[PDB]
């Protein structure tokens, strides 16, 4: 309306009121969520401080819900004109940055706390120097000290050393800096809560040092502290400050307004646990009760914050209503029945154990103490009971830090144990925990020579000397093995081996008995035989303790120990290391009887590879392991099927003795599918490796083929989609064989088999049936052209047809264009039968199951609907309907010109990795998913491929908003600038669309250009990312609620693409699923250093972001905000080496596919991949230097280093020797050079690998089809 009003400036005046009035309106309405919606009205309004006059809790307090950032919303875009450059503008507002700070304080969580922990502490250029530091604590998840030591001096000096940087320190740095410091143990209790709580405020008449405001600038923020502080205090007993002082000043702040007061304290209900109120307990839990009535009623967009918050909440709560209510009726019976029972105690501690978040994981043992207390004091109205309940309370906490892997509060609790139990096993548990606590130090690199002896100081001297023998002498002798894992492992370096500091002397001393000179060679002996010594100390108790208690432990353990030391001997040559190294694996493999009751996929992936390279044990490997999936459920093999399917085919000389055994065992144990793959697999090479081998295995082939008859029925049943790749790919394989030597016979020979089987005889009736309706129509008359010159070619097998195929291809494609008519194919495809109910042969659901135990196909793929469409592609893959047997519905996609046993492996890792997402709680705390897929590889060039919906390229919405905003249909893509950067390309390198990324000089100018161009190109499409992101995004808070998991993608993504290189992604190839509402990568066309090492396609980038990306991702500094996320990827990664070790290990160890046949693949699509493939992999290891380069590549990265090795061996200077040096570039980028550490790089590795990509220098190089330029 103010639009029609020429009056505008005065409208501004109107706003002034509007705003202000609404800011009061904040300042006045409270405990009112419908105004939570109002704040959102307010951000929907159009102005800047339109909000800002709303500070954070001013939006609303401890609960605004996630309207929380929404003010922040306009903040960055428009309110912020200053910070939008991603760096502090001293003229920017503490009322701009800060309000985010304070607000996300109630987003306090891993990511948020990581977010703000430095976040606009970039927005303060003062904060940086100490702030970036102390971030690590919360990154280490330090609620205790390592910060308090790290940052405490910042405000604590009153910035003595700090202020001298420059006049800015200001207040929010100090505000946040302080409230920072205290809030840590404010969650973590202990005395720093009392100490720092004191550091906040006088505890000298708080009540109105509290009521001191109706607008806390802070003060409500300290509000919890001392009433928080009580808790460590409430541990022992009663009679302190907050007891009466707060009990009353809530009888006065009570007289202020009751609700939100309550909402801030059931600290109110908390203290009660001391004084045994039968009454204010009653009503004031009722207040906790109506309270979370508010909570869940106040919430939407269901989230850990929306929830886990409320979860810890209701947990502790009704834990109390327990506690109370049986203080209420504990008298009613008898007197006291729990005197005879108390196991209400069991009923209390068992029911809620310790989930991922550790706030709760304290809150519990708090409550517990408060109860076991009341127990023993109500024992009067016996103690072996409640004491036993103390052991109870403690142990779960103990081991459940052993999950949390967190140092400080642990030993807080370990000392707490030495106090608490003081038993014979008080220690032994203190021990076991301390032991793991090392491995929590072993987690990081810091503590190099240190923690190792530190607790290893305490090793066998006092441990089992405290036992009875004593089941779980298992778990301790184990703990040893843990140790020598550490003491061993600190040499991936010779870190210890080069460090004889003070102790390491003593280490070598004990070493022979359980300097660096003996540690040098003979530590590994000491480590080894005190480990395995502990293994025979532990072996019977592995069987004794509990199902999957210690067997998995000791056994997977020493297994790992070995295979690691194997990897050593893969690198280094020690004959005796091979002697016991190859003596031992005999033991650990067999455990799958005991073992193989969990995934332990280490075991399963190792075991084949063992013989695969080497077998010293003729039947042993065959005896017991042959008993494996023979014995253990049919399903138990499935995860490594791909292995066997080539392994049994091309690899195995031991097939008949072993693999043939189990597989032929597991068909009658209901394995059915292996046909398809084998169908595919045994398709290429029938195994000529050995006589007997091919004989009995080929026998297997024949045995299992029957009933795979109907598979084959799916085979021919899919000549789908369009032959046009049958033809063209025939031109490519055939015409490709024209570059060979003599012996052209087999070459085009099988190509003929499957040509005049597939195509050249379309009307051939046998073909005709399996010929499709597309072929029935247009796959004939031009196939008459093709059968003639193709009959000559059928007669010749000489290279001339390279030109004739030039004709042929042009012919064979150009007359194939109009078809793909979609339910022409489908009714032809409407065979699929279902008579004698498909003749009584049970069928997968199309590749049923991911490798979790017992047959995961109880379903039959059954019918199909003719509904299908292709994504326009080089594939044009048909997306077809799988209609269900058991009343399931399963449509999917197809890949017919290509067949992927490689991306098989690809997910075959993914499943592992997110397997580790499981291994870490905090991953769950980040809700770390996996995009997956599936494939039904029946034969050589093709297999069915899974499909999933609501899923379309980001590029889509990007564009529709692009064009239909930018003019109408144009996008912006016909801008001059794109073709103009192409012009600079042509000026500094060749003229053509293939190369001209060759020459590539002027690295400073490289930066110059790619900046200049890049930015004027790329800003508006960011508005589209956020924008169509909006037309997706229903509610304002839903927006970034979305980019939670969206970013979660781009992170986990970029991780994967370091795990191996990116291809099969333009920018589009990641595609939103609307329910998660975020793109996924399903697309994998490339890996490792080969692809990038292609002179056509050099790519240094460890991943691909773009300008618009980071823009969307925020006016942040998502640098951090996804950075440390990446870290968690790594802190994950550093958990167990052997995982991916085996993964990529046997992974690249196996294939003849992934190189020459993947040469064939890159062929099968990649254009400049044309000659690259063959003349590339020749005389070169995708294997063993890739073996090591990848194995190290795990460990640390001085800047994409082993790639630089690869492309280094590659050619030539102008692209490479130029940029790999120019990867190191100006003091602009010089960080990228100097920052790296060959010795150790991790959170680093992140740091660089992130904006390695940011480098316009790196950017304008890579390629256009990836459009960082756009």
SS3 readout for 609-640:
HHHHHCCCCCCHHHHHHHHHHHHCCHHHHHHH
**C-beta contacts of 1157-1165 below 8 A and 24+ residues apart:** 1157/684, 1158/902, 1160/733, 1161/898, 1161/902, 1161/1085, 1162/1085, 1162/1086, 1162/1091, 1163/732, 1163/736, 1164/729, 1164/732, 1164/897, 1164/898, 1165/874, 1165/898, 1165/1085
- Per the CB < 8 A criterion, the answer to whether 157 and 127 are in contact is no
Q: DSSP E strands: which ranges in 622-779? A: none
**Tokens for 171?**
């207040």
CA–CA distance, 1113 with 1119 (Å, rounded to integer): 9
CA–CA distance, 884 with 860 (Å, rounded to integer): 7
Q: Name which of 603, 673, 675 is nearest 632 in CA terms.
A: 603
CA–CA distance, 507 with 452 (Å, rounded to integer): 9
Instruction: Kindly report the length of the chain.
Output: 1270
Q: Name which of 508, 557, 563, 511 is nearest 537 in CA terms.
A: 557
> Tokens 């064939």 label which residue?
1160
Distances in whole angstroms, Cα of residue 530 to Cα of each of 455, 477, 726: 16, 9, 62
CA–CA distance, 237 with 241 (Å, rounded to integer): 12
Distances in whole angstroms, Cα of residue 710 to Cα of each of 406, 673, 719, 840, 1217: 56, 11, 15, 10, 56
Q: How many CB atoms lie within 10 A of CB 332?
A: 10
Q: What is the DSSP letter of 65?
A: G
Distances in whole angstroms, Cα of residue 46 to Cα of each of 73, 97, 1263: 12, 20, 40
CA–CA distance, 650 with 1157 (Å, rounded to integer): 14
- Per the CB < 8 A criterion, the answer to whether 1112 and 1212 are in contact is no
- Per the CB < 8 A criterion, the answer to whether 232 and 191 are in contact is yes
**Tokens for 26?**
């904040």
CA–CA distance, 84 with 933 (Å, rounded to integer): 39
3-state secondary structure of 895: strand
**Tokens for 330?**
């504990």
H or E stretch including 893? strand 893-895
Q: Name which of 1068, 1089, 1082, 676 is nearest 846 in CA terms.
A: 676
Phi-psi sector, 1240: left (phi>0), alpha (psi -120 to 50), beta: beta
> Tokens 């706003």 label which residue?
15
- Per the CB < 8 A criterion, the answer to whether 1089 and 1202 are in contact is yes
Give the DSSP letter string of 92-114: S-HHHHHHHHHHHHTT-SHHHHH
Distances in whole angstroms, Cα of residue 528 to Cα of each of 450, 476, 522, 603, 735: 20, 16, 10, 19, 57
Walk across the sheet containing 1078-1081 and list its strands.
951-953, 1070-1073, 1078-1081
Q: Which residues, in sequence order, are bridge partners of residue 1071? A: 953, 1080
CA–CA distance, 1154 with 1168 (Å, rounded to integer): 18
> Tokens 């909440």 label which residue?
313
Runs of H (alpha helix) within 356-420 = 358-378, 383-404, 408-420
Resolution (Å) of this entry: 6.6
Runs of H (alpha helix) within 84-222 = 94-105, 110-123, 128-139, 146-156, 160-163, 172-188, 191-200, 207-210
**Tokens for 4?**
């029609």
CA–CA distance, 378 with 1220 (Å, rounded to integer): 74
Q: 543: buried, middle or exposed (CB in 10 Å: 19+, 13-18, 0-12)? A: exposed
> Tokens 């810890």 label which residue?
312
Residue 1064: phi and psi, rounded to 5, are 65, 25
């Amino acid at each position: 309306e103010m639009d029609k009003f020429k009056t505008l400036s005065e409208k501004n005046n109107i706003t002034q009121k509007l705003l202000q009035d609404f800011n009061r309106f904040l300042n006045t309405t409270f405990s009112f969520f419908p105004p939570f919606v109002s704040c959102i009205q307010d951000i929907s309004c159009q102005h800047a401080a339109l909000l800002s006059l709303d500070p954070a809790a001013v939006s609303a307090g401890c609960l605004a819900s996630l309207q929380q950032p929404v003010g922040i919303r306009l903040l960055e875009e428009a309110l912020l004109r200053l910070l939008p450059a991603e760096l502090p503008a001293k003229r920017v507002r503490g009322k701009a940055r800060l309000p985010p700070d304070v607000l996300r304080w109630v987003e306090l969580a891993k990511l948020y706390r990581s977010i703000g922990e430095y976040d606009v502490l970039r927005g303060i250029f003062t904060s940086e120097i100490g702030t970036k530091q102390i971030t690590q604590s919360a990154l280490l998840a330090e609620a205790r000290s390592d910060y308090s030591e790290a940052a405490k001096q910042y405000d604590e000096a009153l910035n003595k050393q700090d202020w001298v940087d420059g006049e800015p320190t200001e207040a929010e740095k100090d505000f946040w800096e302080l409230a920072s410091l205290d809030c840590y143990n404010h969650l973590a209790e202990w005395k720093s809560l009392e100490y720092c709580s004191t550091a906040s405020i006088d505890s000298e008449n708080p009540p109105d040092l509290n009521k001191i405001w109706s607008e806390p600038f802070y003060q409500e923020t300290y509000l919890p502290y001392m009433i928080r502080s009580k808790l460590k205090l409430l541990l022992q007993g009663e009679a302190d400050q907050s007891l009466l002082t707060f009990i009353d000043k809530a009888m006065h702040g009570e007289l202020q307004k009751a609700i939100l007061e309550l909402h801030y304290s059931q600290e109110l209900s908390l203290l009660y646990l001391l004084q045994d109120d039968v009454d204010r307990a009653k009503y004031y839990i009722q207040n906790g009760i109506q309270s979370f009535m508010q909570n869940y009623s106040s919430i939407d967009v269901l989230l850990h914050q929306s929830r886990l918050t409320k979860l810890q909440s209701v947990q502790a709560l009704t834990e109390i209503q327990e506690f109370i209510s049986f203080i209420s009726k504990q008298g009613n019976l008898s007197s006291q029945v729990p005197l005879k029972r108390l196991l209400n105690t069991w009923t209390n501690r068992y029911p809620d154990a310790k989930m991922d978040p550790m706030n709760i994981w304290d809150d519990i043992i708090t409550n517990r103490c408060f109860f076991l207390s009341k127990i023993e004091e109500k024992l009067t109205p016996i103690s072996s009971l409640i004491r036993s309940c103390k052991f109870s309370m403690k142990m779960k906490m103990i081991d459940s830090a052993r999950k949390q892997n967190n140092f400080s509060l642990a030993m807080k609790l370990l000392k707490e144990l030495h106090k608490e139990s003081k038993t014979r096993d008080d220690w032994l548990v203190s021990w076991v925990q301390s032991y793991c606590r090392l491995s929590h130090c072993r987690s990081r690199s810091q503590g190099c020579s240190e923690q190792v002896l530190t607790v290893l100081k305490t090793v066998s001297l006092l441990d089992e000397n405290n036992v009875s023998s004593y089941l779980s002498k298992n778990i301790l002798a184990f703990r040893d093995q843990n140790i020598l894992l550490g003491t061993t492992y600190r040499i991936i370096a010779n870190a210890l081996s080069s460090e004889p500091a003070c102790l390491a002397e003593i280490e070598e001393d004990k070493a022979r008995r359980i300097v660096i000179a003996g540690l040098y060679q003979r530590a590994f002996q000491h480590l080894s035989e005190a480990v395995q010594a502990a293994e025979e100390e532990a072996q019977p108790p592995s069987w004794s303790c509990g199902p999957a208690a210690g067997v998995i432990d000791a056994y997977m353990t020493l297994a790992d120990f070995c295979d690691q030391q194997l990897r050593k001997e893969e690198e280094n040559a020690s004959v005796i290391d091979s002697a016991e190294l190859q003596a031992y694996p005999a033991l650990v493999v067999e455990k799958m009887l005991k073992a193989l009751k969990l995934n332990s996929n280490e075991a399963r992936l190792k075991f084949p590879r063992l013989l695969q390279i080497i077998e010293r044990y003729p039947e042993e490997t065959l005896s017991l392991m042959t008993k494996e999936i023979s014995s253990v459920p049919c399903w138990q093999f499935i995860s490594w099927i791909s292995h066997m399917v080539a392994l049994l085919d091309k690899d195995q000389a031991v097939a008949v003795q072993h693999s043939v055994e189990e597989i032929t065992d597991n068909y009658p144990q209901a394995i059915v599918y292996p046909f398809i793959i084998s169908s595919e697999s045994y398709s290429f090479k029938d195994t000529s490796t050995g006589h007997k081998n091919k004989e009995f295995v080929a026998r297997i082939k024949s045995k299992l083929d029957q009933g795979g008859v109907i598979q084959d029925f799916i085979n021919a049943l899919d000549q789908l989609s369009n032959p046009e790749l049958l033809f063209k790919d025939w031109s490519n394989d055939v015409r490709a064989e024209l570059a060979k030597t003599p012996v052209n016979k087999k070459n085009i020979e099988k190509m003929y088999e499957r040509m005049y089987a597939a195509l050249g005889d379309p009307k051939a009736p046998g073909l005709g049936a399996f010929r499709r309706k597309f072929i029935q129509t247009f796959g004939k008359e031009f196939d008459k052209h093709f059968g003639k010159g193709g009959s000559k070619l059928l007669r010749m097998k000489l290279s001339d047809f390279n030109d004739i195929t030039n004709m042929l291809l042009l012919k064979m494609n150009k007359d194939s264009k109009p078809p793909g008519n979609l339910k022409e194919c489908s009714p032809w495809m409407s065979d699929f039968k279902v008579e004698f109910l498909r003749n009584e042969l049970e069928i997968p659901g199309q590749y049923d199951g991911r490798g979790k135990p017992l047959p995961e196909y109880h379903v039959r793929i059954a019918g199909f609907d003719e509904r299908v469409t292709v994504m326009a592609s080089l594939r044009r893959p048909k997306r077809i309907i799988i209609r269900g047997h058991d009343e399931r519905e399963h449509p999917f996609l197809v890949k017919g010109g290509e067949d992927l046993r490689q991306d098989q492996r690809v997910e075959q890792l993914f499943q592992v990795m997110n397997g580790i997402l499981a291994q870490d709680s905090a991953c769950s705390q980040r809700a770390l998913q996996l995009r997956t897929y599936s494939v039904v590889p029946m034969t050589s060039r093709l297999g069915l491929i899974e499909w999933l919906e609501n899923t379309v390229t980001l590029k889509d919405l990007l564009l529709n908003t692009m064009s239909q905003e930018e003019k109408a249909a144009y996008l912006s893509d016909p801008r001059a600038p794109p073709c103009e950067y192409k012009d600079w390309l042509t000026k500094m390198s060749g003229k053509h669309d293939v190369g001209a990324y060759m020459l590539m000089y002027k690295g400073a100018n490289r930066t110059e250009t790619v900046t200049s161009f890049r930015k004027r190109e790329s800003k508006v499409p960011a508005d589209l990312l956020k924008r169509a992101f909006v037309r997706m995004s229903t509610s304002p808070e839903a927006f970034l609620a979305l980019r939670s998991h969206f970013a979660s993608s781009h992170a986990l993504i970029c991780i994967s693409h370091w795990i191996l290189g990116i291809g099969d992604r333009h920018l589009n190839n990641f595609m939103v699923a609307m329910e998660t509402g975020g793109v996924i990568g399903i697309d994998f066309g490339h890996a490792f250093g080969s692809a990038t090492q292609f002179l056509p396609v050099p790519e240094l980038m460890p991943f691909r972001l773009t300008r618009q990306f980071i823009n969307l991702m925020l006016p942040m500094k998502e640098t951090g905000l996804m950075y440390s996320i990446m870290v968690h990827a790594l802190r994950a990664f550093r958990s167990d080496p052997g995982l991916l070790t085996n993964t990529m290990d046997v992974f690249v160890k196996e294939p003849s596919f992934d190189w020459k046949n993947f040469e064939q693949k890159m062929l099968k699509k990649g254009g400049s991949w044309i000659q690259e493939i063959n003349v590339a992999e020749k005389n070169w290891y995708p294997r063993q230097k890739i073996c090591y380069a990848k194995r190290k590549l795990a460990g640390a990265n001085p800047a994409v280093i082993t790639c630089d090795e690869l492309l280094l061996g590659h050619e030539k200077a102008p692209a490479f020797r130029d940029y790999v040096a120019v990867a190191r570039g100006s003091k602009d980028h010089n960080i990228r050079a100097q920052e790296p550490e060959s010795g150790l790089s991790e959170e680093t590795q992140v740091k660089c690998l992130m904006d390695q990509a940011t480098d316009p220098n790196i950017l304008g190089r890579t390629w256009e089809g990836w459009e960082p330029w756009m």
